[PDB]
Structure 1
Amino acid sequence: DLRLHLLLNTSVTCNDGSPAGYYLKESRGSRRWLLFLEGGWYCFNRENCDSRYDTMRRLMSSRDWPRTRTGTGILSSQPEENPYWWNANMVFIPYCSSDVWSGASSKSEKNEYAFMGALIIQEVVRELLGRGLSGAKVLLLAGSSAGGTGVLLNVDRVAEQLEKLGYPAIQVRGLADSGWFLDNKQYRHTDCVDTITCAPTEAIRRGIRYWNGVVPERCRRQFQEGEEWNCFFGYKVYPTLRSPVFVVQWLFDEAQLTVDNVHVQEGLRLYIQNLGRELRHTLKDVPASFAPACLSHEIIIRSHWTDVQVKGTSLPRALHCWDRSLHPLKGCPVHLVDSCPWPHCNPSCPT
């Protein structure tokens, strides 16, 4: 199990002002640290945040959090379940800011909710340094779905934070799972008048203003003010990053299809095949990646994450090969993208 620690700096809060926190399982024999960002969509105005507070309150508040959690998948400490990093120090950071880990605003007389995702990550890092992170050799910032996009938005800020705090020897890297979305043409279209109809670009643009959202500096400098929503899209923000980042993405991701208004005749067949091709195209110059041709969503904290293979190579193996490459390798590849054109043309896709 991983044990809960609420942040000692209680000014860093979840949406409703309760303290944020993290779950920790230490491994005294290891200098590797894994910090995982939970996902779970987001909200972007008073009305849809109020609805989230009624039926998704654990994603907006810590008052009902349990004292422990079980680590699964890449967060498992058993080698049977986690061939990659089973002996690492394990941290799970709950997502209670509803801001895709981008926010920097407090609850106040003018703000019904606090949006402090970017500050939550920084405060977790700061408090961990006194519990052994000061002696780390690698810090891997991982995450799934909204947490995967959160890795892309924050990995270089963690690197800069540790440099400025005086720990230049810690190597910071990122693992972004199921957070590589396309602002593509949708299969059916509606103008942005409420939550359901509002396309991701328009929703994120409004969210950034509501959250006081922040993006990586080099990406901000490219797109400039008013256009920071561009930096929430993986293929646009990744070229601006300096830390090594490994990208995991199903070619036919279920959340991508949902925001494309897809739930088979010729028109839809062509649409789905073109989505797969566009995704593959955006990964062509990503040297560390794992992209199977499946209809699914998320992978790395599922207990059977070791089952899927691309070209005969599992994800735990590809991550191990990535580790080796950061010390091309004979029979130990790091770029693994399916080329077949339809969901589950890879026989190892999840059932």
Structure 2
Amino acid sequence: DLRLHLLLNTSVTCNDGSPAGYYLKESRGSRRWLLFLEGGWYCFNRENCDSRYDTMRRLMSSRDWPRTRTGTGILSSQPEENPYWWNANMVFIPYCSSDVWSGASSKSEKNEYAFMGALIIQEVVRELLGRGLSGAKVLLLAGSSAGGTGVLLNVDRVAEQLEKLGYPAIQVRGLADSGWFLDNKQYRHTDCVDTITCAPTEAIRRGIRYWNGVVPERCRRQFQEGEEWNCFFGYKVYPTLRSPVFVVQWLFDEAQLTVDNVHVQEGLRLYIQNLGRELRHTLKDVPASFAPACLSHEIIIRSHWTDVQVKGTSLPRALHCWDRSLHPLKGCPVHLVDSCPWPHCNPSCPT
């Protein structure tokens, strides 16, 4: 189990002003630290945030969080379940800011909600330094879904924070799972008139304004004012990053298909095949990646994350090979992208 710590700086809050926090399981003697960002979509105006507060309140508030959580998948401390980093110091950071981990805005007389995702990450890192992180050799910032996008948006800022605080020996790296999206044409189209009909580019453009969202500096300087939404798309922000980042992405991610309005005749067959080909293309120059040809919403904190393989290599193995590469390697690959063109053409896909 990982134990809850609410942030000592209570000005760093979830959406409703309750303190943010993190769950921690220390591993004495290990100098590896895994900080995992939870996912769970986002909200981008008062009305859709209000709805989320009614039925997804744990994603907007710490008031009902449990005292402990069980670490699973890459957060498991059992080598049987986590061949990669079972002995690491484990940190699960709940997603309670609804801002893809990008926000820097407090609740105030002008703001019904606080959007502090970027500040939550910084505050967790700061408070962990007093709990052993100061001795770390590697800090892996990992995350799934909106948390995977959050890794891309925040890994270089964590690296900069530690450098400025006087810890240049901690190697900051990113692991972005299921957060690599395409700003593509939908299979069926709707103008952004309400929440359902609004495509992610427009929802994110509105969200950045509502959240006071921040993006990595080099990407911000490329796209400039009004266009920072571009930095939420992996293939555009990744080339701007300095920290090593390993990208895990299903070629047919269920969230991508959902925003594309895909719920099989020739038109849809071609659409799906083109989506997989486009995703594969965006990963061509990503040297550390794992992209199986599966239709899935499954994530790296699931207990059976060890089962899927690309070209005969599992993700825990690929991550271990990545660790070795950061000290090509005979029999220890790090670039694993399926080439077959249809979901479940890989037999190891999740059932």
Whole-angstrom distance in 2 between the partners of 1:58 and 1:276: 33
Q: Which runs of 4+ in 1 moved over 3 A?
A: none
Deviations 1:315-349 (A, max 9, x none): 00000000000000000000000000000000000
Tell me, which stretches of 5 or more residues in structure 2 are unaligned? none
1:297 positional shift: 1.5
Aligned partners of 2:290, 2:307: CA distance in 1, in Å?
Answer: 13
Secondary structure at the counterpart of residue 207 of structure 1: helix
Distance 2:268 2:300 in 1: 29
Q: What's the offset of the Cα at 1:2?
A: 0.2
Q: Distance in 1 between matches of 2:196 and 2:232?
A: 19
* Contact 1:182 1:256 (C-alpha < 8 Å) held by counterparts: yes
Deviations 1:233-273 (A, max 9, x none): 00000000000000000000000000000000000000000
Q: Which whole-Å CA distance do the structure 2 matches of 1:33 and 1:90 have between them?
A: 6
RMSD (Å), alpha carbons: 0.4
What do the CA deviations read for 1:95-127 (whole angstroms, capped 9, x no partner)?
000000000000000000000000000000000
CA displacement at 1:29 relative to structure 2? 1.7
Structure 1, residues 153-180: CA drift from partner, whole Å, max 9, x if none?
Answer: 0000000000000000000000000000
- Residues of 1 paired with 2:252 and 2:158: CA distance? 31
Secondary structure of the residue that 2:3 maps to in structure 1?
Answer: strand
SS at match of 2:155: helix
Q: 1:145, 1:298 within 8 Å by CA — same for their partners in 2? A: no
Q: Is the 8 A contact 1:250 1:293 kept in 2?
A: yes
Q: Which residue pairs with 2:116 in the alignment?
A: 116
Q: Structure 2: how far apart are the matches of 1:311 and 1:27? A: 33
Give 5+ residue unaligned stretches, structure 1.
none
Which residue in 1 is equivalent to 2:50? 50
Q: Distance in 2 between matches of 1:290 and 1:191?
A: 34
- Residues 1:105 and 2:105 are matched in the alignment: yes
* 1:215-249 CA-partner distances (Å, limit 9, x unpaired): 00000000000000000000000000000000000
Give the SS at the match of 1:131: coil
Q: Is residue 2:84 matched to residue 1:74?
A: no
**What SS is found at the alignment partner of 2:130?**
helix
Deviation at 1:130, TM superposition (A): 0.3
Matches of 2:273 and 2:124, distance apart in 1: 41
1:286-340 deviation digits (Å, cap 9, x = unpaired): 0000000000024210000000000000000000000000000000000000000
Describe the superposition over 1:51-100 as per-residue Cα deviations: whole angstroms up to 9, x where unpaired. 00000000000000000000000000000000000000000000000000
For the residues of structure 2 that align with 1:7 and 1:201, how far apart are their CA atoms?
Answer: 32
Looking at structure 2, the residues matched to 145 and 94 of structure 1 have their Cα atoms a distance apart, in angstroms, of 13
Answer whether contact 1:144 1:298 (CA < 8 A) is retained.
no
Following the alignment from structure 1 to structure 2, what is the Cα–Cα distance between the partners of residues 76 and 200?
32
**Alpha-carbon separation, structure 2, partners of 1:60 and 1:200:** 20
Secondary structure, aligned partner of 1:321 = helix
- Residues in 1 aligned to 2:298 and 2:6: alpha-carbon distance in whole angstroms: 27
Match for residue 160 of structure 1? 160
Supply the distance in 2 between the matched residues of 1:186 and 1:309 (Cα, whole angstroms).
29
Q: Distance in 1 between matches of 2:17 and 2:298?
A: 29
CA contact (8 A) 1:152 1:176 kept: yes
Asked if structure 2 preserves the Cα contact closer than 8 Å seen for 1:296 and 1:350, the reply is yes
Corresponding residue for residue 129 of structure 2: 129
Distance 1:200 1:298 in 2: 20
- Separation in structure 1 between the aligned mates of residue 29 and residue 135 of structure 2, nearest angstrom: 11
Percentage of pairs with the same residue: 100
Q: For each residue in 1:182-216, what CA deviation from the matched residue of structure 2 results, as whole angstroms up to 9, or x when unmatched? A: 00111000100000001110000000000000000
SS at match of 2:28: coil
Query: For residues 298 and 229 of structure 1, what CA distance do their matches in structure 2 show?
Result: 25
SS of the residue corresponding to residue 29 of structure 1 reads coil
Q: Which residue of 2 aligns with 1:169?
A: 169
Cα distance in 1 for partners of 2:302, 2:105 equals 32
Q: What is the CA-CA distance between 1:28 and the residue it aligns to?
A: 0.3
Aligned to 1:147: 147
